[PDB]
Point group: D2
Chain length 118, copies 4
């Protein structure tokens, strides 16, 4: 089976993708996708509950992300959910759900892109 739990999110980047490198020399980009849904007999529609999702994406992919996308860029993200743990100074278990990004791209819904393949 390999029931990796998959998700697709659409939204905007809270800020420029943070790019870092591990002990092992490997690349990583961190960024948070903020999704805003919408809901309808209210006259017009309305906005909705904003959802911030932290995103991790590794290696060559990550450099591409870093040098293509800015604060506020609207993107579309396919990936897997991961549960990270860590502790407070006082030893409290904290957990966050994060996204392991498999594919990501800018969204031509409201814009145009120039594709540089390889």
């Amino acid at each position: 089976m390999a029931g990796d739990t998959t998700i697709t999110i659409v939204g905007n980047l809270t800020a420029d993708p943070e790019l870092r490198f591990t002990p092992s020399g490997a690349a990583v980009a961190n960024f948070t996708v903020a999704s805003t849904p919408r809901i309808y007999q209210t006259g017009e529609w309305k906005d909705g509950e904003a959802l911030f999702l932290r995103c991790n994406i590794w290696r060559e992919a990550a450099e591409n992300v870093a040098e293509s996308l800015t604060r506020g860029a609207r993107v579309i993200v396919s990936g897997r959910l991961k549960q990270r743990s860590f502790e407070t100074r006082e030893g409290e278990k904290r957990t966050v759900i994060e996204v392991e990004v498999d594919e990501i791209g800018p969204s031509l819904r409201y814009a145009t892109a120039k594709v540089n393949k390889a």
Copy 2:
């Protein structure tokens, strides 16, 4: 558009679905779905990083859940992700991602069910 961020999860219930009722008299069931993925040239496959996901489901749906599913039942869940906030005694912002369940069912992958419609 109405970009509500959707997800499908498969896994087991950590324990019997907790059923409660609001001020307003409304029903709610709480339960946590634990997903276990798998990953392959290791000889055989292997298990993987377990993912606990807390789940909320409201109203008539909720009673149905409550009186159909037990600790450990393997289920399949379609729904939307929500970001809840709350604070520690000391005023720390804590956030959890939870699931608003739209459809759920037992999984005939390993079992049989008796359907009682209405």
Copy 3:
């Protein structure tokens, strides 16, 4: 990073599942799910165009399915999409898109069910 195109579908079975057996022993169920969305000032939300999808499930699940489910039953399905290239009486090719079902269950949205392992 593999890439079978996954899908989740919710709807009603059109008919009692069709459970066959290969000479080579193994079990096979087939069926079809009608996803009827309830997605213009007239009320709140009224049916609109159903979608029908041939599903293929195999092995022990298939038995379990056939045994449990029933024309009309409401189900949730997680599968992958597959093209299978058909061949008509007249000829041509006539390719069609179908669903390798990974998991399936009856929806407790409008129903109870008792379970059996």
Copy 4:
């Protein structure tokens, strides 16, 4: 709770997008995405059966798409599935499953792109 059956698809465009215009003013792009999975002791993982899906996108996105993308380009797509009932030269009906695209972008898995709003 609506219920258009949503899908996400990743693959390569088979051809330069086809951008038309309705007499009634409006824009329409059409194209087709080849989802090629890379999902038996021989290595690690080798191509295997592609899946091809006719996509329909509309309005301003369509312009934006046509303008930005290119035969061969790798894309991510979020859409809903629709049956549209066809009609062949010989007759019959010949129904086919397609994709109302909601969002689409080029994948930065193997590429850079500069963006323009």
